């Protein structure tokens, strides 16, 4: 009771929003969701293994790729066991477990000892072979020794959870639905009218506009908008979308007609409306505008066996199922899908198109859809198609049972795969009608089960709460629900992290107020010293990479980055002892820009890598951690031994072909290291040429493109033209110019086609991730989404796609420096 208020105030600090507050509400759905999420939390906390939770072994049941088998010498992975300034190497095979390795060590000079990684809080533990650990695969990929420290396991009592102290709609009639629009109000384009839509999954079932009156401070209509749809006909999660036009949309607000308790909405509502800045995720929100003083408001009143198909039609049905998600279904396609629904149900890929064809505004039709969803032996037995699963969780589907079967397929995901899709799955909670949902419980459950997922779950939820008024109320209830079962050790760790972000965001606002200058470098090193002496914690877990513990600031190494945005080049000491080297943990702390759009671009690029792993292609674009920490701010990994090619080129806008290759000659001393860097350049450049072409972000200036000393190319910014950057300086490194060819350029083409075709095998997955980004990330249009189809070349064989992408390579070679030079013209 007394201490619970302090614990509640502790949660509010971590969450960044007061869940107990009821200023911006008209119902108890948020409070019901807090109470509702008690059951899945305590079940998941009870079911989880205490030992494996504390140690959190990051593993994958996927196969090891062909390129990583060639890194293994003679079926023998070298693993070095360290123990208080004494190291010993062991001959261990890929199929051996940690338990087998422990027995092998303890033979040559027992139960209460575990193999922790050197430097990181990462544990080689549990009934899993040594190749399946993701740290072991990272060491073999990058070409580094697997250094391991022998020590006692962490205590599960540190992860203790506290004691927590806590179908048909009623008034069913055959009458038509109506709403009285009383009027509107605002304190601070000379005509307006209210448009009352009845939406269900971005689909207007009925629409009734008011009469056009003049745009004054208080416009009062006082009129029943009588619709032609019954009360029984209203489906669950039906959305009363109220909008104010003037041709020109000004304001909007939504209201759920059927509530969380299966009851129809009634009584007086003065809903405070969101202002506009086409369709997006913010358009769908049940939350009202919290800023009640300035915002627009709207006052309302609510008061109340089977035969075989023909061969033509089966071919016609299979033709409809074969098309992509963005291919629009006609009225003829929907009627065919519905009439032959039991044949459509035998194909899993039909499901998005089938449940799009449902007439959700008829109660009898929804009942048949539920009867159809009952017997789904094919869907349950099918292999996990994540792209197909992601379709059913987008804006087009509002039914709980349709969305629940998608979430059911997500249950079979391993923890490694959940991390790849976690950001997008957290963004997919915006498309839910209700606060409590199957997806919300899935994210909670898998967050509570694994520490790594739960770490990134915290930051994805906390970032949205900060920079989105539309969905902060939903995410705070989910985040509170995670934090109430994550454990005391993690609660302590998240507090230490938030304190570092809070202090650094306080420091960074003052620096931007005060181009490079003498005072700016001194004032930063002043402020970083002041916090470090007392207030700043002794250590903290790195948000983008929770294995690393960053300690105290190396304030001599700290600086402000010389740009317009002025990000903070911070540099921390490694807190955990027994590290390999004495290299500092470098962190760029970004501020000012909205990172939400760019965070989702990055996560797709990480999904593109995992596609290229499954078909044996080692491109490895994007070699740095990056994460959004709050409102307009973020935290990014520094790559040691790396610079921008604009710095390399000029060492006014005069470019050079030879200079980039001479830079690689300088930094890599030997010819084997040089040819490795030329090879790594060919693989990475081919990855970026393919990836940016698909996403439509290839035309770019060279100041935001970087290259490591090891040859690995990477990008630090995302958006008479070129489809991607393949300039003469890049082509020179391969060994060609103008109208010539070479072994590396031929290899670049072979890698480009293989990588491009590899992405085409997951066309539907990439389409929906691209579609979900533009709605959830950006505060868009159908035509913006339709580019990726043309970029992927949908409905064309591998020879035509090869010919298509090879032509786009030749476009870059003809123009060359024209696009890069045009930045200097357009600069002036
Ligand atoms: C897309 C967005 C994302 C939403 C945040 N991103 C990603 C990103 C990466 C890096 C980066 C990452 C590793 N390294 N390693 C380095 N050595 C550098 C280095 C040395 N000098 N410069 C000039 C760079 C670096 N920069 C820097 C930036 C910056 F522009 F904010 F500063 C952003 C940035 O805004």
From Swiss-Prot:
Which gene holds the coding sequence for this protein?
PIK3CG
Q: State the top-level EC class.
A: transferase
State the family it belongs to.
Answer: Belongs to the PI3/PI4-kinase family.
| Miscellaneous remark of the record | Candidate target in therapy for inflammatory diseases. Selective inhibitors and protein ablation are anti-inflammatory in multiple disease models such as asthma, rheumatoid arthritis, allergy, systemic lupus erythematosus, airway inflammation, lung injury and pancreatitis.
* Pathway as given in its UniProt record: Phospholipid metabolism; phosphatidylinositol phosphate biosynthesis
Q: What is this protein called?
A: Phosphatidylinositol 4,5-bisphosphate 3-kinase catalytic subunit gamma isoform
What SUPFAM superfamilies does this protein map onto?
Answer: ARM repeat, C2 domain (Calcium/lipid-binding domain, CaLB), Protein kinase-like (PK-like), Ubiquitin-like
Tell me the subunit arrangement. Answer: Heterodimer of a catalytic subunit PIK3CG and a PIK3R5 or PIK3R6 regulatory subunit. Interacts with GRK2 through the PIK helical domain. Interaction with GRK2 is required for targeting to agonist-occupied receptor. Interacts with PDE3B; regulates PDE3B activity and thereby cAMP levels in cells. Interacts with TPM2. Interacts with EPHA8; regulates integrin-mediated cell adhesion to substrate. Interacts with HRAS; the interaction is required for membrane recruitment and beta-gamma G protein dimer-dependent activation of the PI3K gamma complex PIK3CG:PIK3R6.
The UniProt function text for this chain reads: Phosphoinositide-3-kinase (PI3K) that phosphorylates PtdIns(4,5)P2 (Phosphatidylinositol 4,5-bisphosphate) to generate phosphatidylinositol 3,4,5-trisphosphate (PIP3). PIP3 plays a key role by recruiting PH domain-containing proteins to the membrane, including AKT1 and PDPK1, activating signaling cascades involved in cell growth, survival, proliferation, motility and morphology. Links G-protein coupled receptor activation to PIP3 production. Involved in immune, inflammatory and allergic responses. Modulates leukocyte chemotaxis to inflammatory sites and in response to chemoattractant agents.
Instruction: Give the modified residues of type Phosphothreonine.
Output: 763
For region Catalytic loop, the annotated ranges are 696-704
* PROSITE patterns according to UniProt: C2_PI3K, PI3_4_KINASE_1, PI3_4_KINASE_2, PI3_4_KINASE_3, PI3K_ABD, PI3K_RBD, PIK_HELICAL
* Residues annotated for ATP binding in this entry: 586-595, 621-629, 714-719
- EC number(s) for this protein? 2.7.1.137, 2.7.1.153, 2.7.1.154, 2.7.11.1
Domain (PI3K-RBD): residue spans on this chain: 74-152
């Amino acid at each position: 009771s007394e201490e619970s208020q302090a614990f509640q105030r502790q949660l509010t600090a971590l969450i960044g929003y007061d869940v107990t507050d009821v200023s911006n509400v008209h119902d108890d759905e948020l409070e019901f969701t807090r109470r509702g999420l008690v059951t899945p939390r305590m079940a998941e906390v009870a079911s989880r293994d205490p030992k494996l939770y504390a140690m959190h072994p990051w593993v994958t049941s996927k196969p090891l790729p062909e390129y990583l088998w060639k890194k293994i010498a003679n079926n023998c992975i070298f693993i070095v066991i360290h123990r208080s300034t004494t190291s010993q190497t062991i001959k261990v095979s890929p199929d051996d477990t940690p338990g087998a390795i422990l027995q092998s060590f303890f033979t040559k000079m027992e139960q209460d000892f575990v193999l922790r990684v050197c430097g990181r809080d990462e544990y080689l533990v549990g009934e899993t072979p040594i190749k399946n650990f993701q740290w072991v695969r990272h060491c073999l990929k990058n070409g580094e020794e697997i250094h391991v420290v022998l020590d006692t396991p962490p205590d599960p009592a540190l992860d203790e959870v506290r004691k927590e102290e806590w179908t048909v709609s009623l008034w069913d009639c055959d009458r038509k639905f109506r709403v009285k629009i009383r009027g509107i109000d605002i304190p601070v384009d000379l005509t307006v009218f209210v448009e009352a839509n009845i939406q269900h999954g971005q689909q207007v079932l009925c629409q009734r506009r008011t009469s056009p009156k003049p745009f004054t401070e208080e416009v009062l209509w006082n009129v029943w908008l009588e619709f032609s749809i019954k009360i029984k006909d209203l489906p669950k999660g039906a959305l009363l979308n109220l909008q104010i036009y003037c041709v020109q949309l000004l304001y909007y607000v939504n209201l759920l007609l059927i509530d969380h308790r299966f009851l129809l909405r009634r009584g007086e509502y003065v809903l405070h409306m969101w202002q506009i800045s086409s369709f997006n995720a913010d358009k769908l929100t049940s939350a009202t505008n919290p800023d009640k003083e300035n915002s627009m408001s709207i006052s309302i009143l609510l008061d109340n066996v089977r035969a075989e198909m023909p061969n033509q039609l089966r071919k016609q049905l299979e033709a409809i199922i074969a098309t992509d998600p963005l291919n629009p279904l006609t009225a003829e396609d929907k009627e065919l899908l519905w009439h032959f629904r039991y044949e459509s149900l035998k194909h899993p890929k039909a499901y998005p198109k089938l449940f799009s064809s449902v007439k959700w505004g008829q109660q009898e039709i929804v009942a048949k859809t539920y009867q159809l969803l009952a017997r789904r032996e094919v869907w349950d037995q099918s292999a996990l198609d994540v792209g197909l699963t992601m379709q059913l969780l987008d804006c087009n589907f509002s039914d709980e049972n349709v969305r629940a079967i998608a979430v059911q397929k997500l249950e079979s995901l391993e923890d490694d795969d959940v991390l790849h899709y976690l950001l997008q799955l957290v963004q997919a909670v915006k498309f839910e009608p209700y606060h409590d949902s199957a997806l919300a419980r899935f994210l909670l459950k898998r967050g509570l089960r694994n520490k790594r997922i739960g770490h990134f779950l915290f930051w994805f939820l906390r970032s949205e709460i900060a920079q989105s008024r539309h969905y902060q109320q939903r995410f705070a209830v989910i985040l509170e629900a995670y934090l109430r079962g994550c454990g005391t050790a993690m609660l302590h760790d998240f507090t230490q992290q938030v304190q570092v972000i809070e202090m650094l965001q306080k420091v960074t606002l003052d620096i931007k107020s005060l181009d490079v200058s003498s005072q700016v470098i001194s004032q930063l090193k002043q402020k970083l010293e002041n916090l470090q002496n007392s207030q700043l914690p002794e250590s903290f877990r790195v948000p983008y990479d929770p294995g690393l513990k960053a300690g105290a600031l190396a304030i001599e190494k700290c600086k402000v980055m010389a740009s317009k945005k002025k990000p903070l080049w911070l540099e921390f000491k490694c807190a955990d002892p027994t590290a390999l080297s004495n290299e500092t943990i470098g962190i760029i702390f970004k501020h000012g820009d909205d990172l939400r759009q760019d965070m989702l671009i990055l996560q797709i690029l990480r999904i593109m890598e995992s596609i290229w792993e499954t078909e044996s292609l080692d491109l490895c674009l994007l070699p740095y951690g990056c994460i959004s920490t709050g409102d307009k701010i973020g935290m990014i990994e520094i790559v040691k031994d790396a610079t921008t090619i604009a710095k390399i080129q000029q060492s006014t806008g005069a470019f050079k072909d030879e200079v980039l290759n001479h830079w690689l000659k300088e930094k890599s001393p030997t010819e084997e290291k040089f040819q490795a860097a030329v090879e790594r350049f060919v693989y990475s450049c081919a990855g970026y040429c393919v990836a940016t072409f698909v996403l439509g972000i290839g035309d770019r200036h060279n100041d935001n493109i970087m290259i490591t000393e090891t040859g690995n190319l990477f990008h630090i910014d995302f958006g008479e033209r070129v489809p991607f950057v393949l300039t003469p300086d890049f082509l020179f490194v391969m060994g060609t110019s103008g109208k010539k060819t070479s072994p590396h350029f031929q290899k670049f083409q072979d890698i480009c086609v293989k990588a491009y075709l590899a992405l085409r095998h997951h066309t539907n997955l990439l389409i929906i991730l691209f579609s979900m980004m533009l709605m959830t990330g950006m505060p868009t249009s159908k035509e913006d989404i339709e580019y990726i189809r043309d970029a992927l070349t949908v409905g064309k064989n591998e020879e035509d796609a090869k010919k298509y992408f090879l032509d786009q390579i030749e476009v870059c070679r003809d123009k060359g420096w024209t696009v890069q030079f045009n930045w200097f013209l357009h600069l002036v």
